[PDB]
């Protein structure tokens, strides 16, 4: 029986990211002295489009506290920030859109992007065009701060995790129908070779668990076990319910 | 540009062949003003620190 498609992807061949044009990797300034005792000013020098990315990047330059030289970063531009704006990054920094601040130093309800899970991880949560996280409370002893991620999951991280005030630019990108195959084609052209998708049900059995049969059909329950095994896992993996979600969602 | 005399690679004001002149005009005012305001900032909050 053939190795099925989702196993092929993992060896990375034709499947690696299409990376040539990307601006570089977006990430918060390293968490040095300045940024964790005081604050430090930069200028957003240019907000610029990263290929295969939802949202704009924002080239933002600073001085090097230790050497005479400019050091620049790549920020995912939060909506509203602009060329020439000044950015402040540090514990003791003000609470405006664009600035980056430790989740401790912002009151509940603040709305921040590109927030790191562990302090200094140069930023992990909420980076997609549109997304953000709201702080939903603090526990001063063992400095934690609780947030609600884009998914709706709540999660509770260190007060020193730096976030950046605001939401991520280019929002609403997904309200626009792609309309034709070509746009999806050109979309994926700059991400990775994952389009278009042949249904497992159009293949022969060599090819897929869904393969073959005299009509197209899945033949057995397509909800597959967590403890399935590579070559089995295709369909609705670990699915704990299934069917048209009738009723208002939204976690409590 | 290395087969061609220095005058071809500049104009005569500060930042010759480098910034756009209307852009140096700007540097200058800003330079001047931000520096002047520094004095006010120094001496205004200097006042505070005897009356507070």
């Amino acid at each position: 029986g053939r190795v099925i498609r989702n196993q092929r992807k993992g060896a990375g061949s034709i499947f690696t990211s299409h990376t040539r044009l990307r601006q570089g990797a977006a990430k918060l300034r390293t968490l040095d002295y300045a940024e964790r005792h005081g604050y430090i000013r930069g200028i957003v020098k240019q907000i610029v489009h990263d290929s295969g990315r939802g949202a704009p990047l924002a080239k933002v330059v600073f001085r090097d506290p230790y050497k005479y030289r400019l050091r620049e970063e790549i920020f995912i531009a939060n909506e509203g920030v602009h060329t020439g704006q000044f950015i402040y990054a540090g514990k003791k920094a003000s609470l405006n859109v664009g600035n980056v601040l430790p989740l401790g130093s912002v009151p509940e309800g603040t709305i921040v992007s590109n927030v790191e899970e562990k302090p200094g991880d140069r930023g992990a949560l909420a980076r997609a065009s549109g997304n953000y996280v709201i702080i939903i409370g603090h526990n001063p002893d063992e400095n934690k701060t609780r947030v609600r991620l884009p998914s709706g999951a709540k999660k509770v991280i260190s007060s020193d995790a730096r976030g950046v005030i605001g939401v991520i630019a280019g929002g609403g990108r997904v309200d626009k129908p792609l309309l034709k195959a070509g746009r999806a084609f050109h979309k994926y052209r700059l991400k990775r070779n994952s389009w278009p998708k042949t249904r497992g049900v159009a293949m022969n059995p060599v090819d897929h668990p869904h393969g073959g049969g005299n009509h197209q059909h899945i033949g057995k329950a397509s909800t597959i076990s967590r403890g399935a095994v590579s070559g089995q896992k295709a369909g609705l993996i670990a699915a704990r319910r299934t069917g048209l979600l009738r009723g208002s969602q939204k976690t409590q | 540009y290395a087969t061609v005399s220095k005058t071809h690679k500049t104009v005569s004001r500060a930042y010759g062949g480098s910034r756009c002149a209307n852009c140096v005009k700007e540097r200058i005012i800003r330079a001047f003003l931000i520096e002047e305001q520094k004095i006010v900032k120094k001496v205004v909050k200097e006042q505070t620190e005897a009356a507070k």
Binding site: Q46, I47, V48, H49, G54, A55, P56, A58, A77, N78, E79, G80, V81, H82, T83, G84, S94, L95, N96, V97, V106, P107, G109, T110, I111, S129, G130, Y132, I165, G166, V167, A169, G170, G171, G172, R173, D175, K176, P177, L179, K180 | -
Partner: protein, 91 residues
Amino acid sequence: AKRTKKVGITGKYGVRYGSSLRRQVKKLEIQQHARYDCSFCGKKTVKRGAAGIWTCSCCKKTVAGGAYTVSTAAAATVRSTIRRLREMVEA
């Protein structure tokens, strides 16, 4: 001379895709091609190019915005809150 009764800019697509999809695109297209007021010098000269990048003909300021509109409801109301929350920490 009124040129189309209703498909507007969406005429290029002609008959394909279906009235409803065309209807949706037409909206955000009108949104994204439109020419906006600039916060900074106050001339309506902010046009898009690249999603979320809005930049200004004269005075050359580029603003990061929504993917098809300059400002976004969410981002506005966030701006709004950050005001509110900031002020709580001046007085």
